[PDB]
Design a protein around this ligand. Sequence first.
Ligand code: A1AB9
Ligand code: A1AB9
Ligand code: CL
Ligand code: CL
Ligand code: CL
Ligand code: CL
Lengths: 4, 4, 124, 124
Amino acid sequence: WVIP
Amino acid sequence: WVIP
Amino acid sequence: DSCIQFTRHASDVLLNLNRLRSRDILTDVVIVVSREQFRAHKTVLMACSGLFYSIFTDQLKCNLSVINLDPEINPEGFCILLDFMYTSRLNLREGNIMAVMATAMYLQMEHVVDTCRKFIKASE
Amino acid sequence: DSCIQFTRHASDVLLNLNRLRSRDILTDVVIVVSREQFRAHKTVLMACSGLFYSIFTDQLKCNLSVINLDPEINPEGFCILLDFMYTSRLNLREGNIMAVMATAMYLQMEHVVDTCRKFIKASE
Ligand SMILES: N#Cc1c(Cl)ncnc1Nc1ccc2c(c1)CC(=O)N2
Ligand SMILES: N#Cc1c(Cl)ncnc1Nc1ccc2c(c1)CC(=O)N2
Ligand SMILES: [Cl-]
Ligand SMILES: [Cl-]
Ligand SMILES: [Cl-]
Ligand SMILES: [Cl-]
């Protein structure tokens, strides 16, 4: 999971 | 395009 | 093999599947979550959820145009997960995390359940 | 928005759509290319090809279960492009490049046409  |  | 790969292909396919969903193009099922209805593509649902994969591989349920979810399922939680299926983006907030996690457990979406557990553990 | 994103989601969806195709699950069209037939999902075809996007948004053609391609289309070229649609991987070889490029032009798959043009220009 990432900060897009 | 890339070499996978 | 000796194939070449187009890096953005999978993301572009998903963007187009979401565009078709938004325009109600070739949607083949309506998911009913208490008073709310959500139109979708069976193949996208199966590709994202262990529960839908099970439902639509069933010889009788594969032909249904309407699927009714358990009354305990929160429509907003379902909406957030349906958006995630079609975009890879999860709108996870303090106010919806419990509903999102419960819906992801029911839908059998392991990666979502995992990030919800991690976000909850960080707040305790 | 304040969304989080699952990096592998789009790739995982496409992998599952390819698995459904391989098992002939919820495929809703057969593409006929001279003596050869290819089963697929209309939504995946539309998401990858300008030609299929046009065909399946047509009020009459959207309901067809069989689509016959132009007799000049090479079945192997179509097979290579169909695999690319479902995997992001293009099996481009000296022996098939002309057929692949011609099929990609017909199917309106701009990124494929682009790499074929570049590979051809490098060999002249
Ligand atoms: N459509 C399809 C499909 C196929 Cl073909 N093969 C394998 N899994 C498929 N889908 C599916 C099954 C289980 C789970 C998910 C997706 C996400 C998750 O957390 N569990
Ligand atoms: N399905 C869908 C779709 C939608 Cl909804 N919006 C926009 N394009 C869509 N698909 C589509 C149209 C044109 C081309 C491609 C795909 C690849 C390419 O080279 N040209
Ligand atoms: Cl029904
Ligand atoms: Cl997931
Ligand atoms: Cl027909
Ligand atoms: Cl393309």
